[PDB]
Amino acid sequence: VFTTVDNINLHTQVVDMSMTYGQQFGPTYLDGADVTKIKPHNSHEKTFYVLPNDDTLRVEAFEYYHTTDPSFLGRYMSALNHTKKWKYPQVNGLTSIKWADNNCYLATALLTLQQIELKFNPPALQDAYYRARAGEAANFCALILAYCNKTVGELGDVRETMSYLFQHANLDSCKRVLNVVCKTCGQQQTTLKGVEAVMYMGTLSYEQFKKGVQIPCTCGQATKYLVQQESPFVMMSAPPAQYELKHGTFTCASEYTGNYQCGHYKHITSKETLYCIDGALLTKSSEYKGPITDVFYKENSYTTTIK
Ligand SMILES: Cc1ccc(OCCN(C)C)cc1C(=O)N[C@H](C)c1cc(-c2cnn(C)c2)cc(-c2cnn(C(C)C)c2)c1
Ligand SMILES: [Cl-]
Ligand SMILES: [Cl-]
Ligand SMILES: [Cl-]
Ligand SMILES: [Cl-]
Ligand SMILES: [Zn+2]
Ligand SMILES: [Zn+2]
Ligand SMILES: [Zn+2]
Ligand SMILES: [Zn+2]
Ligand SMILES: [Zn+2]
């Protein structure tokens, strides 16, 4: 019998058939199911996931997941019991998810991550991220739910899910410098780094951010524009409104229709033409107009031209 916390460093233990796994190993999981109350069986003699009970397992658990929350393995194994049953079709060369248990926001996020450049700091996230691009995205979706502290069936927001994931990614080299102009106060330059340098809530178009956005001032309206952007991408979010998506001006977008929270997501991507991925469904179009809430753009190093 093998016990592990990372499926890498395995620990071989000797088991019997009298006591259950709970008494011998603590809460133990096979695949995604809970074999805590289940007694050992013949075909079980394989590797089992156990909650860390010593310092060696606690250290290995942090090295793989970068978390010390004792409930993390439980939330992760509970989500995996559903995600392993989902279907992950290949739509337009991308891995999507067939609709199941309100996974519309998870599918839009999964398709978005396969199109932007991202390096995850937790090794467990990075390893499953690679398998997700290759078609095996069950572990990756389950880990996303665990890190975001969300459960299967819960209604998720794509912008909130991306932000949670961005905080577990290497965005240290990302830098955004803004300039807020105000006729009374003057000019103030602010520098953002990391997660805050790649996301903005207000407008959907990256060009309006470069031209200037009407932002309030402490004295009372100013204008904020982008001076310099050094990031592999930018995420522009705005409340759901009708927007015009043109081929070649963006990478991918998030469509939200329906009421607040209990609504549905769809993924729009710009290839040789505009593609609409709704789980397992694909529709193409030369132009698009609909309710868009998130737009992702590509970037490397931008520097403004206004004094
Ligand atoms: C699907 C879903 C799941 C979870 C969730 O959790 C939010 C709670 N969270 C704070 C923890 C939200 C959503 C969700 O509805 N998302 C969508 C994208 C959404 C729709 C609407 C909206 C308004 N009218 N109608 C008919 C729809 C408004 C907005 C909106 C507005 N302003 N903001 C910014 C500033 C925070 C966002 C977001
Ligand atoms: Cl960490
Ligand atoms: Cl992390
Ligand atoms: Cl609202
Ligand atoms: Cl772009
Ligand atoms: Zn970490
Ligand atoms: Zn389910
Ligand atoms: Zn299920
Ligand atoms: Zn002012
Ligand atoms: Zn849905």
- For 51-174, which CATH superfamily applies? Papain-like viral protease, thumb domain (1.10.8.1190)
Place of tokens 């330059």: 189
Q: Indicate if the alpha-carbon torsion angle 169, 172, 252, 294 is positive or negative.
A: positive
84 φψ region: left (φ > 0), alpha (ψ -120 to 50), beta (else): alpha
CA distances from 280 to 127, 267, 269, 271, 283 (A): 24, 11, 14, 18, 10
The torsion defined by the Cα of 148, 239, 306 and 187, in degrees rounded to 10, comes to -80
Residue with the smallest CA separation from ligand 1 atom 33 is 239
Where does 1-50 sit in CATH, by number? 3.10.20.540
The residues with which 4 forms a beta bridge, in sequence order, are 49
Tokens at 224, concatenated: 């904020």
Length of the chain: 307
The residues with which 213 forms a beta bridge, in sequence order, are 224
Q: Three-class SS string for 209-268?
A: HHHCEEECCCCCCEEEEEEEEECCEEEEEEEEEEEEECCCCCCEEEEEEECCCCEEEEEE
Q: Where are the domains of the chain?
A: 1-50, 51-174, 175-307
Contact 297, 206 (CB under 8 A): yes
What gap in Å lies between CA 62 and CA 69, rounded to an integer? Answer: 9
**CA–CA–CA angle 216, 222, 226 (5° rounding):** 105
Q: Please, what is the angle between helix 158-166 and helix 138-147, to 10°?
A: 90
Contact 105, 257 (CB under 8 A): no
Question: Buried b vs exposed e over 135-174: b needs ≥16 C-beta within 10 Å?
Answer: eebbbbbbbbbbbbebebeeebbbbebbbbbbebbebeeb
Residue with the smallest CA separation from ligand 1 atom 13 is 261
Contact 255, 237 (CB under 8 A): no
Place of tokens 């407008």: 203
Using CB distances shorter than 6 Å, the residues near ligand 1 are 155-157, 160, 201, 239-240, 256, 259-261, 263, 293
Q: Where in the sequence numbering do the catalytic residues fall? A: 104, 264, 278
**Of 156, 126, 129, 153, the residue nearest 141 (C-alpha):** 129
305 φψ region: left (φ > 0), alpha (ψ -120 to 50), beta (else): alpha
**Of 134, 30, 33, the residue nearest 88 (C-alpha):** 134
**CA–CA–CA angle 168, 169, 170 (5° rounding):** 135
Name the binding residues for Zn(2+). 182, 185, 217, 219
**Of 135, 112, 163, 154, the residue nearest 268 (C-alpha):** 112
Mutate to test the pocket of ligand 1, among 103, 104, 237, 260 (most ligand atoms within 8 A of CB): 260
Place of tokens 């290759």: 134
Q: Please, what is the angle between helix 104-113 and helix 158-166, to 10°?
A: 50
What gap in Å lies between CA 147 and CA 126, rounded to an integer? Answer: 13
Cβ-proximal residues to 209 (8 Å cutoff; 6+ apart), any chain = 200, 203, 225, 226, 236
Cβ-proximal residues to 147 (8 Å cutoff; 6+ apart), any chain = 67, 122, 125, 164, 165, 168
Cα 121 to averaged position of ligand 3 atoms, centre (Å): 5
Contact 175, 193 (CB under 8 A): yes
Where does 175-307 sit in CATH, by number? 2.60.120.1680
For the chain, first and last CA: distance in Å?
A: 68
Q: Coil, strand or helix: which one is 174?
A: coil
Tokens at 151, concatenated: 């459960």
Question: Buried b vs exposed e over 26-62: b needs ≥16 C-beta within 10 Å?
Answer: ebbbbebebbbeeebeeeeeeebbbbbeeeebeebbe
Q: Indicate if the alpha-carbon torsion angle 262, 263, 269, 275 is positive or negative.
A: positive
Q: Please, what is the angle between helix 138-147 and helix 104-113, to 10°?
A: 110
